[PDB]
Amino acid sequence: AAALLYCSNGGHFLRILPDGTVDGTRDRSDQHIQLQLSAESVGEVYIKSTETGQYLAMDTDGLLYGSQTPNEECLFLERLEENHYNTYISKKHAEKNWFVGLKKNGSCKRGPRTHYGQKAILFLPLPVSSD
Numbered sequence: 001a002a003a004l005l006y007c008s009n010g011g012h013f014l015r016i017l018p019d020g021t022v023d024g025t026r027d028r029s030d031q032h033i034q035l036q037l038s039a040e041s042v043g044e045v046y047i048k049s050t051e052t053g054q055y056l057a058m059d060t061d062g063l064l065y066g067s068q069t070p071n072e073e074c075l076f077l078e079r080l081e082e083n084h085y086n087t088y089i090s091k092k093h094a095e096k097n098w099f100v101g102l103k104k105n106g107s108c109k110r111g112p113r114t115h116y117g118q119k120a121i122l123f124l125p126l127p128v129s130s131d
Contacts, residue, residue: 001034001050003127007102008085009119014102016049022056022064024102028094030128037078037125044075044091046088050131058090062098076100081116 005014012024015033025033025036034051047056047084054066057074067074075091096112101121103109114121 001030001082002036002129003050004028004030004033004131005035005126006126008122008124009102010089012102014100014108014123016054016056016066018052018054018066020054020066022066022099022108024106024108026106037076037127038070040075043078045078045088046070046074047076047088058092058098058100060093060111062108062112062114064108064110065098068071068106081122083122084124085122086125087121109116 012026013033015023015025036048038046038048049056052066053076055070055074056064057067058064071091076088077091078086079089080086090098097115099114099117099121101114
């Protein structure tokens with residue numbers, strides 16, 4: 001439903017859980033991982049996780065949560081990694097280059113550690129517009 005988010009940090013997908021929780025998964029688990037990249041024009045997308053209806057929104061520890069509110073944190077700047085891979089700068093900390101990246105053990109590990117070079121942050125939108 002609408003979009004899928006893959007990570008070439010080995011071979012995982014991003015995962016949204018109803019209880020405001022974001023993590024990763026080694027399976028095509030688009031039972032839960034459904035999303036919508038709802039641009040505020042200038043790359044910064046409001047990722048409305050269609051499944052739950054929750055906005056994919058980074059905290060100041062780089063922990064993504066399932067938000068009820070579209071804000072400066074959910075504004076996920078499509079910073080396509082020069083390479084094919086496309087990954088999301090959390091607007092607020094653009095200068096600290098706070099990116100979206102998956103920890104190996106199916107986890108949402110961002111804060112001040114997710115940045116370019118790392119396969120950790122190698123994301124590939126596999127979007128699925130069945131709506």
